[PDB]
RNA sequence: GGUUGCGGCCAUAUCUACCAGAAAGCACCGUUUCCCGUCCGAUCAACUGUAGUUAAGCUGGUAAGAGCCUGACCGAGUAGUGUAGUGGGUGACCAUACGCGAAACUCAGGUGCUGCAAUCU
RNA sequence: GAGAACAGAAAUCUCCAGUAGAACAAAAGGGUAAAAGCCCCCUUGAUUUUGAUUUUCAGUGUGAAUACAAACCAUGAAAGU
RNA sequence: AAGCUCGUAUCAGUUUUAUGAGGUAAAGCGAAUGAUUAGAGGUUCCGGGGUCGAAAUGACCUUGACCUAUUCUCAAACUUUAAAUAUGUAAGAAGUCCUUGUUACUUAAUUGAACGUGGACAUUUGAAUGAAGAGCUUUUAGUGGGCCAUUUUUGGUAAGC
């Protein structure tokens, strides 16, 4: 049964993983603030690996997590990229999905040769409503399985509105 | 070298007991004590101040002081051929009111009863106890219960 | 060794009467193997204490012989004859502790027949001598009286 | 759940659950046990505290002490008994929060006797004072703030249900840096923006400034200030007058009831599944291998 | 450089297993305990004998070792590869010590010697299982294997069905019922207790009470 | 009887799957002027109680369910142990005598009780 | 575990599960989950006075510790610590 | 050794009763940690091998690892359970109950806390057994190589070690 057991789209998290500091992070970093609007979060390298050439808390990436209609349009704007093809994979057991597009030209947003080019992450996820009982603080409960956003349901979901494609097996 | 520091062979003492972790219930702070009650002692491992050490574990004692934390116990330990009057600040998770008593309490709040309510009838009291008596006659029948006979078994293996 | 002296059997071959409790049936079960002891008839009660009965009067052990000595300190509690001694010890009386008491302990010499057995330190169940062997204690004393 | 999750007997049997008013989401234990305790030297005194709560929109005040048996009400106040004294409206606001614990205040201090003498601060300019005690007589009724699991934000309003309670004349010790109207880069508090929460001229000035840019959204919310004729201004008036009623009498109105408790109980059962006895779980063990086994 | 056996039959210590504390300690002369046709299911091997022990000793593993080699080489050669399931049903995991030899009885803590296995009076050492058929054949292997053995052993025909825990007809009437389901090399049984669903899955051949 | 706030003992309250929940209450839920917090009004803050919903929370019921709790001459007077002997045995060890006495096992029964305050067909 | 450009066994992002299987300088053992662990905010109580007490014990000393009294402070809405 | 103050008093290498403490023995391992034998059933876009192959996030065999339910065996420095023997305290006149003073501590509070004044109840007055009595003080010798037996027990192949 249903009435606002939905499938609103929680929050959508982009991201830029840059396998060093400095300006060619920071340029990284540009991208996603004047492509969210928000003020984007660094990450720490969270150990060292030489031949990925990364000291621990080195800042290594940048990504932000955006969320309500801002939303929508950024995961269009992308999923224009994708041509509206995805995969089997992509969406999670648990519900949610994304997907990755190189050069962030090929979603509105100019060029200049001062910032380069950049590669992305999308990461949509997903719920219903009263995800809030996760979430609050005080009795924090968890959500029942009729409710629990499943992958079948979001590829559904995914398939109705955009009319967009799956594909494969 | 050896070693002998305060909390030395308490491993399993001042352990915690299977599925018994944490916060300690609030009743253990509610719990009240007064001078001249006489509590138990045992160390409860989750909470490192105010602890009795390891000797005093499992000892008996009578409050002579209570402060706002802790209550301070006397315990008479034996060194030598003689006993010595220890005083033990504890923190009251390490305390309980012992009912090495209650017993006595319930036998004289009992005592005052039938002693009046035997008086003010005709006297003829008793009211020391007395220790287990062996048993007197009786007479069993076999009445639905005419003896079995066993005998001893064979030795037999089974394995 | 403490109970031994609690039941005032501080020598070999004496001998004193007990009130069977729990709590003295314990202090029984602990020295088993130094004693013997059993279920005392109205005859050898008796001549234990025509024989050898002695009453603790400011100490000194003084012998029965004359029922004043009895009246004089146990007629307080009744009890006033050597007889009226020996019925309250048979019928564990209710002044049984202060009668019991006055006897000094019971001093036997060694049986006459002997021991039955070979060998004493074991259980009378066992062919020894030491434990409960009930009505028979009454064949051992007489021989020891 | 997932297969590869799922739990085996050996986690479910070392398992230590937690309290239950833990498992439930709503005691923490640790400030429980520091709120309640007292100096053993004091015996036994009761340590009370003004429990404060919100739900989605009802405001509870209870007075309430500690028993080992389990707790104990001196007194309850609810901000949904603010009708009785002129309030019907935005009952989960700041004000209704002030004028609830003002209504607690006045409740218990009525029901011991430190009524007539300390009143607190009748006047109310939100200034900051708690109440002090009187030269030559009782000392006042001291209680500590449960504020339970909600946050200390500068501006929250479970510190609103605080300052009435203490401007109601119950000694409720407390710093003045949580109010609204506290100065973040000074140490010094603003009276006249907490005098306007305590009146509501945050909620008035929301309502002023609807009515001339934007009706649709002043017509879905303050609805029922239109339906009954409340436009902002009136505001404060109104809560200064729930202040006059509330102290006039706040000896507390139980609810009519109508209905029995009898009768409750039994309308109630209705609904109410009954457990099953052995005898019933056998026969549908034994009926479910007669069909699921017999070879249909 | 073995030192004779007599030197630690008796059980004169504590366990000293290998450990975080011990560690330097030599392999176990015997490893492995399960051999002939072990693959074979709980209803081809009815009968079983024991080896067992009439002692509180210590059992060497190379001794351990030696007794399993000479049981199993008779059994087969006389009767088979196939025929027999030999068990060693004891496991060395105790370490023996030595003094090895400027200094004499000062700090004199010796180092890992060798293993062996602690057994009481009345255990079990070697198990084995077979064809009823084949009884004498067995029983001679365990009493040649007997000879590598310090202190007395003595061999026990079984009451139960091979190494299974119940006696040769009170498995019949399980299996001629419903209730047992072939395993690896051991067997199920049906429980009444738990998820009557799962239960009727498994044992599709009970729920009927009959064949 | 339900529910809520505060609880006490802290699994007979937990876990897994499914179903049912009147009324009130809780809840989810709407908003961003104001105090306040964020990469994000998701959390946290505030405002409305108006615009919506029992889907989730919550409560209850089902299950030869997992776990947990209780009981029993179920196992077992078994293991182990205090005491005794110029007892057996080459030893290793083992019987016996007066006492104390488990754990696993197996079978049955059970699945939160309850204190204060307010509310409720 | 399941998901996301370059990106791979290992970079960064998300969600589910998670009784602690981690972390708490150090040996090990106790102990700890709205914490005792991780992140942040504010700090000097690591302070002043002189007694009592527990361990080791001679019931000496020393080390270390515990509960108070008299100060002055820190923090927190507060109970407190 | 010298005594001294008292004396049915108070005392105890003992039991009983009531109430605690404990993690050894045993036990356990289809309970945690750590060891250990065996198969059986699963799962890989994924440790490698091999056939088909242009490949495949291809299929099929395969051997490994993991998973599920089983199986044989273990622990001084493992453990849910958990003895016996040992072990703390209590069994009254220094007790139990009523009335209602003192204070600067403490409570919202003559509230509490401590110490009391006045009043009520005697030896079945509060278990056993014993007691050639109990308590207390001073001063001083010798000693400060120990060895043995049953049981528990460490090192050692062992020892009259
Ligand atoms: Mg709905
Ligand atoms: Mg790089
Ligand atoms: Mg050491
Ligand atoms: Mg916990
Ligand atoms: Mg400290
Ligand atoms: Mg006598
Ligand atoms: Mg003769
Ligand atoms: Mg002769
Ligand atoms: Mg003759
Ligand atoms: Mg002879
Ligand atoms: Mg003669
Ligand atoms: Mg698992
Ligand atoms: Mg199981
Ligand atoms: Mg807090
Ligand atoms: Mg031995
Ligand atoms: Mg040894
Ligand atoms: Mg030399
Ligand atoms: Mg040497
Ligand atoms: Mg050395
Ligand atoms: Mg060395
Ligand atoms: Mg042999
Ligand atoms: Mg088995
Ligand atoms: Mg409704
Ligand atoms: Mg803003
Ligand atoms: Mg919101
Ligand atoms: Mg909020
Ligand atoms: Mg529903
Ligand atoms: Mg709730
Ligand atoms: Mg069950
Ligand atoms: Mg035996
Ligand atoms: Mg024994
Ligand atoms: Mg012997
Ligand atoms: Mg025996
Ligand atoms: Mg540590
Ligand atoms: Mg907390
Ligand atoms: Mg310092
Ligand atoms: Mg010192
Ligand atoms: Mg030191
Ligand atoms: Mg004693
Ligand atoms: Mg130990
Ligand atoms: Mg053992
Ligand atoms: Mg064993
Ligand atoms: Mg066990
Ligand atoms: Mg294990
Ligand atoms: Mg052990
Ligand atoms: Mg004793
Ligand atoms: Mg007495
Ligand atoms: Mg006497
Ligand atoms: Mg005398
Ligand atoms: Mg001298
Ligand atoms: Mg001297
Ligand atoms: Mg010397
Ligand atoms: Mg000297
Ligand atoms: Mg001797």
Redesign the pocket.
């Known amino acids: ?5 939905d499938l609103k789209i929680e ?1 959508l ?1 982009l ?5 060093e500091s400095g300006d060619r992070l920071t340029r990284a970093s540009k991208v996603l603030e004047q492509l969210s609007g ?4 660094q ?1 720490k ?3 060292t ?1 030489r ?4 000291r621990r808390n080195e800042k ?2 940048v ?6 209609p801002k939303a929508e349009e950024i995961l269009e704007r992308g999923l224009k990229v994708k041509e509206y093809q995805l ?1 089997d ?6 519900g ?7 050069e962030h030209i090929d979603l509105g947003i100019k060029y200049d040769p001062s910032i380069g080019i ?6 949509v ?1 997903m719920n ?20 629990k956003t499943t992958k079948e349901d979001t590829v559904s979901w995914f398939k109705q509105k955009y009319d967009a494609d799956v594909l494969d ?1 | 070298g050896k070693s ?1 520091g ?2 030395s062979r ?7 007991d ?2 018994k ?3 300690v ?4 702070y509610l719990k009240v004590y ?3 009650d ?1 509590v ?1 002692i ?1 160390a409860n ?2 909470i ?4 009795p ?1 390891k ?1 005093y ?4 004692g009578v409050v002579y002081n209570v ?4 209550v ?1 116990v006397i315990i ?2 034996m ?2 051929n003689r006993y ?1 009057e ?4 504890l ?1 009251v998770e390490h305390i309980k009111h ?7 309490l319930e ?3 009992a ?2 009863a039938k ?1 009046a309510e035997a008086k003010a009838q005709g006297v003829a ?8 008596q062996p048993r007197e006659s009786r007479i069993v029948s076999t009445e639905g219960n005419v003896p079995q006979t066993l005998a001893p078994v064979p030795y037999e293996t089974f394995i | ?3 031994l ?4 059997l501080t020598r070999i071959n004496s001998g004193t009467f007990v ?1 069977v ?4 049936l ?2 029984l ?2 020295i ?2 130094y004693v013997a002891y059993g279920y005392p008839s109205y005859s050898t009660i008796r001549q234990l204490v025509y024989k050898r009965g002695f009453g603790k009067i400011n ?1 000194q052990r003084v012998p029965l012989s004359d029922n004043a000595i009895i009246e004089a300190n146990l007629g307080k509690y009744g009890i006033l004859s050597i007889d009226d001694l020996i019925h309250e010890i048979i019928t564990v009386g209710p002044h049984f ?1 202060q009668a ?2 006055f006897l000094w302990p019971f001093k036997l010499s060694n049986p006459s027949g002997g021991w039955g057995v070979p ?1 004493k ?3 009378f ?2 062919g020894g001598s030491f ?1 409960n062997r009930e009505e028979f204690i009454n064949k051992l004393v007489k021989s020891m009286n | ?2 297969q ?29 046990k ?2 309640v305790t007292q ?1 053993k030297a ?4 009761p ?1 009370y505290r003004l ?1 404060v ?1 919100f ?4 405001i ?1 005040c ?1 007075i ?1 002490s ?8 001196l007194a ?1 106040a ?1 901000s949904h008994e603010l009708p009785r004294y002129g309030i019907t ?2 009952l ?3 004000a209704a929060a002030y004028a609830t614990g003002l209504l607690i205040a006045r409740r218990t201090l009525q029901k ?3 009524d007539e003498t300390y009143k607190g601060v009748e006047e109310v300019e939100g200034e900051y004072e708690l109440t002090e005690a009187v030269e030559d007589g ?5 209680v ?16 609103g249900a ?1 300052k009435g309670a203490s401007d109601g004349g119950l000694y409720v ?3 003045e ?2 109010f ?3 100065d ?1 880069e000074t140490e010094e508090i603003d009276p006249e923006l907490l005098r306007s929460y305590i009146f509501g001229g ?2 008035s ?2 309502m002023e ?1 609807l009515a001339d840019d934007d009706e649709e ?1 002043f017509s ?6 239109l339906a009954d004729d409340i436009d902002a201004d009136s505001l404060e008036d109104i809560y200064t007058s729930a202040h006059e009623a509330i102290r006039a009498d706040p000896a507390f109105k ?2 009519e ?3 029995t ?1 009898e ?7 209705k ?6 006895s ?1 005898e019933e ?1 056998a026969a ?2 034994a009926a ?2 007669a069909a699921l086994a017999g070879q249909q | 450089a073995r ?1 004779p056996a ?2 630690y039959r ?10 975080r ?2 560690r330097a300690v030599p392999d176990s002369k015997i ?4 051999l002939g046709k ?2 074979a299911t709980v209803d081809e091997f009815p009968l079983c004998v024991h080896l067992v022990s009439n ?3 210590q059992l060497s593993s190379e001794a351990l070792e030696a007794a399993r080699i000479c049981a199993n080489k008779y059994m087969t050669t006389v009767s088979g590869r196939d025929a027999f399931h030999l ?1 060693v ?3 060395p ?1 105790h370490v023996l ?3 090895k030899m400027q200094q004499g ?1 000062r700090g ?3 180092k890992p010697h060798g293993l062996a296995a602690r057994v009481d ?1 009345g ?2 050492i070697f198990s084995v299982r077979t064809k009823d058929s084949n009884k004498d054949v067995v029983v001679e292997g365990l009493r040649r294997a007997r000879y590598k053995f310090p ?2 052993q003595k061999i026990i025909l079984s009451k139960k069905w091979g ?1 299974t ?1 119940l006696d040769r007809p009170e498995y019949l009437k399980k299996r001629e019922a419903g209730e047992v389901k072939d ?4 067997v ?1 049984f ?8 799962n ?1 009727i899955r498994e044992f599709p051949e009970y729920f009927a009470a009959q064949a």
């Open positions: 049964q249903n009435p606002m057991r929050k998290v991201n830029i993983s840059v396998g928000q003020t984007p979060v990450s390298a969270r150990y690996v031949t990925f050439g990364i290594i990436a990504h932000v997590t955006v969320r309500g995969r994979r992509n969406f999670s057991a648990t949610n999905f994304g997907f990755g597009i190189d950049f590669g992305m992450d999308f990461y996820v219903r409503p009263g995800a809030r009982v996760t979430r609050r603080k005080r009795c924090k409960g968890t959500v029942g399985n009729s409710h097996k | 002998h305060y909390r308490t491993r399993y003492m001042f352990q915690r299977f599925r972790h944490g916060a219930h609030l009743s253990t007064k001078v001249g006489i138990d045992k491992g989750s490192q101040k105010g602890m050490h000797f574990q499992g000892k008996t402060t706002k934390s802790s301070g008479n330990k060194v030598g010595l220890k005083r033990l600040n923190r012992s009912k090495c008593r209650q017993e006595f036998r004289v709040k005592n005052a002693r009291v008793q009211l020391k106890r007395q220790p287990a | 060794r403490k109970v002296q609690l039941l005032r009130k409790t729990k709590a003295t314990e202090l079960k602990l088993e193997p100490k502790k019991n008491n060998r330190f074991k259980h169940i066992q434990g | 759940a997932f590869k999750d799922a739990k085996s007997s050996a986690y479910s049997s070392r398992f230590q659950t937690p309290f239950r008013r833990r498992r439930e989401g709503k005691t923490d234990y640790y400030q429980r520091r709120l100096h004091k015996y036994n005194t340590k429990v709560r739900t989605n929109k009802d509870i209870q309430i500690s028993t080992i048996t389990g707790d104990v009400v309850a609810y409206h935005g989960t606001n700041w011991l006797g430190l009782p000392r006042p009724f001291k500590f703030l449960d504020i339970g699991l909600q946050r200390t934000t500068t501006g929250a309003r479970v510190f605080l010790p407390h710093s840096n949580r609204p109207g506290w973040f945050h909620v000035q929301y400034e959204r879905e919310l303050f609805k029922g200030y139980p609810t009831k109508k209905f408790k009768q409750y109980a039994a309308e109630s059962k609904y109410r599944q009954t457990k099953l052995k779980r549908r063990v479910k291998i | 030192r007599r030197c008796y059980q004169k210590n504590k366990p000293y297993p290998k450990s504390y011990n490893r492995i305990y399960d072990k693959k002692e509180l000793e068990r049903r004891v496991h995991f010590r030595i003094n009885m004199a803590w010796g009076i255990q079990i202190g007395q190494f825990n395993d690896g090399a051991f199920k049906l429980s009444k207790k738990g998820s009557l669903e239960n």
